[PDB]
Write a protein that binds this ligand. Structure first.
Ligand SMILES: Nc1ncnc2c1ncn2[C@@H]1O[C@H](CO)[C@@H](NC(=O)[C@@H](N)CO)[C@H]1O
Ligand SMILES: Nc1ncnc2c1ncn2[C@@H]1O[C@H](CO)[C@@H](NC(=O)[C@@H](N)CO)[C@H]1O
Lengths: 143, 143
């Protein structure tokens, strides 16, 4: 898994064209979204993650939790961003892992947001530009 | 080298704290910048690139040129983004390569922008969300 963490003043998204034949069904209210004072977690689920979705998910939850706590972000946004990596996991596994990360962070008590799965989406973000506002992490199952 | 290409309506940046002891000296006019209808090239220069800065630079110029042409972007912005990778090249090599990519794209006839080197910078971007608006590329010297 490849994660790009951007501590932002805000993040907005707008669902555009479907990127998969059968994307996540959504309502009008879910086509757009916004969150402020948030640690945006752009995530690309990789092929190697298919070996152990739960393990990789839990590792990601912990890593994202540490960063959020370190930068003082109470809000976290799980953003599907396949193009962060070149070796992607199949769609169902990406969906599974993206959901597990979201559920885990929520269960940990963070205010968490997410965007619909299976779409090309426009987005607007404002990075704080602090020393720790931009971080990358590679999380893979223990081999 | 790791490159994240985001076709955007605009990109703005604001230089914040110095990230290096001796960053690129700049004027007041260079602390901030903006470009519209642009292919933003977030670049992280990697350790392996130190083996052949010119080769990697020329490969990057070609790859970025192809994408810009494919998405119809006449404007390109070379944005230093070290945290895209985990194995970074030393600062002088990153500076060298970031400059070579900028010079090359300019010499190729594109309208090119750049941000000062050696700083933590805040930024605002708006991604178009088209199928090809988000792309990643790994460019390394021929081993
Ligand atoms: N391995 C993977 N990791 C993360 N997301 C993945 C995925 N495989 C499929 N997706 C989902 O399908 C859309 C097109 O790849 C993805 N959408 C996106 O990556 C948008 N940022 C494009 O604008 C995402 O919803
Ligand atoms: N290997 C490398 N690749 C790209 N940029 C590099 C680099 N080594 C040093 N820099 C420059 O120094 C700042 C702190 O790493 C870098 N700044 C940044 O990455 C800002 N986006 C932080 O907000 C950049 O100016």
């Amino acid at each position: 898994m490849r994660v790009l963490l951007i501590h932002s003043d805000y993040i907005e998204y707008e669902v555009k064209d479907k990127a998969l034949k059968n994307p996540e069904p959504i309502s009008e209210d879910m086509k757009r979204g916004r969150m402020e004072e948030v640690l945006v977690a752009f995530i690309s689920v990789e092929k190697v993650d298919e070996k152990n979705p739960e393990e990789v998910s839990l590792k990601a939850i912990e890593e994202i939790s540490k960063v959020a706590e370190q930068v003082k972000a109470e809000n976290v946004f799980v953003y599907p961003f396949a193009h962060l990596s070149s070796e992607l996991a199949k769609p169902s596994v990406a969906m599974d892992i993206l959901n597990r990360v979201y559920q885990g962070l929520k269960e940990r008590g963070f205010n968490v947001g997410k965007a619909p799965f299976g779409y090309y989406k426009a987005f607007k973000i404002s990075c704080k530009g602090h020393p720790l506002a931009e971080l990358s992490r590679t999380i893979v199952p223990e081999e």
